[PDB]
């Protein structure tokens, strides 16, 4: 779905500074990604960043914190880390769906470098379906937002936020088109239940 | 693309009887199908056997201990080593299959008995998905789409042509389109194996 290009000024939106401390860098095994605080001392990230690792570090404002995988399943895109002594507060998920054309922001760590807010716009909420690959862990079907944005693998596990600073979903991929894929809040809810989070 | 319904008579084609001994049931600690590609070597679906330390291959309705010897999370097929496995290798077809061609899926639906599932080639296509971050599997694959009553138990099984040669490896089904299977082409399989030095 064609939407207007994202608003470049979003990088300087006050929501970015307000949300930034709760968006953290993840280093595993070396696999790199983004996560965010979802409750005190608990970080959500992409399962593929931490899969099978007993050696995960979370970085919040340039300082390392030991992390332990506490909720994980190969059939699920998201994972939860326990992070003792993690100062930043949790982010809160938005109750209702984002709307077509809405200004939104991807927050994360492109290239494993510094924090960057990536301006974005909601294209559409869709049912993303693939072929049933026999025995393949990945879900066959996911509720996602397609967003107009130039996302990068370093943003994986990072939140898509609305302008209120609430979390609309989790970045997990990109079209093979200036189009990112984001798990919806409802999709995340269902996945969390699966892993006992 | 739409093709005629598969020929039910294919179940009775002698080439099924001739190739059957070389098509094996796989149990791993998941169930699937495999086939002999060289003496004591069985090709199957990577997902049936991924990370598994306990794999049994059944050939004469007789169990054989198997081990995953070629595997990578980025590759859809795996090779099993199976000491003292009697049946001979199936041979891969040198030529691609055409639209409308009579073909047969050989495998073990539901982890039960050997069944030949009549099939027909729809098309050779590129199967593409989104770039799922951190997912090691191929974003694109050369496959045949086929018309057939496939089932997850068939995974890792050969799609054979009327010469009893292997066109590809059964690896999935369509969710929206009924009676539609996906089969990794011979070239796709060779290419993936080469990537991991197998």
From Swiss-Prot, chain B:
Single Gene Ontology BP annotation: proteolysis
Subunit annotation: Monomer.
Keywords (A to Z) from UniProt: Autocatalytic cleavage, Disulfide bond, Hydrolase, Membrane, Protease, Transmembrane, Transmembrane helix
Location in the cell: Membrane
Miscellaneous: Disulfide bond increases the proteolytic activity by stabilizing the protease in the conformation in which the active site residues are properly positioned for substrate binding and catalysis.
Function statement: Required for M.tuberculosis resistance to oxidative stress in addition to its role in resistance to acid, which is essential for virulence.
One term of GO molecular function: serine-type endopeptidase activity
GO cellular component terms, A-Z: membrane
Main localisation: membrane
Family label: Belongs to the peptidase S1C family.
Name of protein: Serine protease MT3772
First-to-last residue of the parent protein present: 182 to 386 of 397
Entry annotation: catalytic residues: 47, 76, 155
